[PDB]
Structures are given as C-alpha cells and as structure tokens.
Amino acid sequence: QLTEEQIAEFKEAFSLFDKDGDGTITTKELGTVMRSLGCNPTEAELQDMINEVDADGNGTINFPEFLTMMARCMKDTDSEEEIREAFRVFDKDGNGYISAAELRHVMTNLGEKLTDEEVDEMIREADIDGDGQVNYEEFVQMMTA
Ligand SMILES: [Ca+2]
Ligand SMILES: [Ca+2]
Ligand SMILES: [Ca+2]
Ligand SMILES: [Ca+2]
C-alpha cells in the first residue's frame, strides 16, 4: 500500500515519462523512472519484476503496474535496510562476522535466555561456509528465509 502523497508523486514522475499520454511507458523507461524516484534495482531484479507484474511480456507497462512495482521496490529496500541495521547490532565490533559471543551478548541484553549450547547451535546452522561465524550473507539467509 502507498499513501495518497506517494501515489501523486509517482503519478507526476510517470506522466513525465509518458510524453505521448497513452497511459503506458516502455520497460526501458521503467528502469529510468524508478531510478529517478530513488529505486536502484539490478538488471536481474528489474527484469524479474517486469516478467512477474507484466504477464503479457509486451514491453510496455501501465500506471497501476508501475505503482505496484514502486510499492514492491520500496518494501524490498526497506527490508534490506532493516536487515543491515539488525546485522550492525549483532556484529558488535563491526568486523563483518557475528561470533557466538556476540550472538550471546545480544540474546542476553534482549531478555532472551538460552543455554550456550543453544547459542552455539543458532551459529552452527546459520554458519554455512563453516568458519564458526555468521557473515552478512549467511545472516540474510536466516532473516529472509
Ligand atoms: Ca507512453
Ligand atoms: Ca504489458
Ligand atoms: Ca563481529
Ligand atoms: Ca560462516
């Protein structure tokens, strides 16, 4: 869901790219307009968004489709940021790896009470590359999935 204000702003930007007024823009214009609004998807993310929202695959998208993608890109951008912030919290020394000690130092300060063996298990399962710690990627793997 978008607020009244965001929809009006998005409509103004969309109309700027819809010079002919036929109510649609090309998928190329889509990326350009999204970037002007502060959304920076990778080629892959953009294309998957397109194929997923634009079921006809004909190279043009309309205003409501555009709103739906701006909504999705905003949700995704907020999640990612929420996760990064969450990461910086666990990773106390900011060296890019969450150690067992740091996971503990957090469950404690949080209020959660867990036996060290259990603190170690969260790490063990999150730890994918087997270095005994959780890097950023292994972290987002636990958060998203
Ligand atoms: Ca147009
Ligand atoms: Ca279409
Ligand atoms: Ca650390
Ligand atoms: Ca690891």
Side-chain angles (χ1 to χ4, degrees):
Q1 274 292 166
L2 279 41
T3 66
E4 169 195 28
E5 169 81 294
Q6 306 168 302
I7 284 166
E9 283 175 354
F10 294 175
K11 185 215 294 164
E12 297 163 343
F14 183 92
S15 87
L16 177 69
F17 283 83
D18 179 29
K19 308 170 178 62
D20 50 321
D22 78 338
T24 77
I25 68 175
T26 67
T27 43
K28 170 82 62 190
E29 294 174 307
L30 176 63
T32 302
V33 67
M34 289 185 79
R35 283 164 202 123
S36 75
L37 285 171
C39 247
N40 304 295
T42 61
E43 292 297 5
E45 301 167 350
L46 180 49
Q47 195 57 59
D48 296 329
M49 212 167 242
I50 292 168
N51 302 324
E52 176 167 351
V53 183
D54 204 35
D56 59 6
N58 68 346
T60 56
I61 74 129
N62 60 40
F63 182 50
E65 281 178 296
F66 168 69
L67 288 181
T68 291
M69 297 190 265
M70 282 304 301
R72 178 172 301 175
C73 180
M74 296 183 276
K75 182 182 186 288
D76 292 2
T77 294
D78 292 327
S79 299
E80 187 182 317
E81 291 170 352
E82 289 182 8
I83 295 183
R84 278 182 187 281
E85 189 172 64
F87 194 81
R88 309 171 211 287
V89 168
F90 288 59
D91 181 35
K92 289 290 183 175
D93 62 3
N95 77 318
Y97 300 88
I98 299 166
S99 60
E102 287 169 326
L103 185 57
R104 207 309 177 307
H105 186 295
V106 158
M107 304 308 244
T108 287
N109 291 181
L110 166 165
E112 183 64 1
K113 54 180 179 304
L114 8 83
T115 66
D116 297 324
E117 315 77 49
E118 297 194 302
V119 166
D120 282 53
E121 181 59 312
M122 297 187 260
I123 293 295
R124 303 182 204 129
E125 64 180 300
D127 178 30
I128 293 177
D129 53 17
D131 74 341
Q133 335 184 85
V134 180
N135 60 31
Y136 181 71
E137 294 89 347
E138 302 172 313
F139 184 71
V140 321
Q141 234 60 70
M142 286 300 278
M143 292 308 89
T144 64

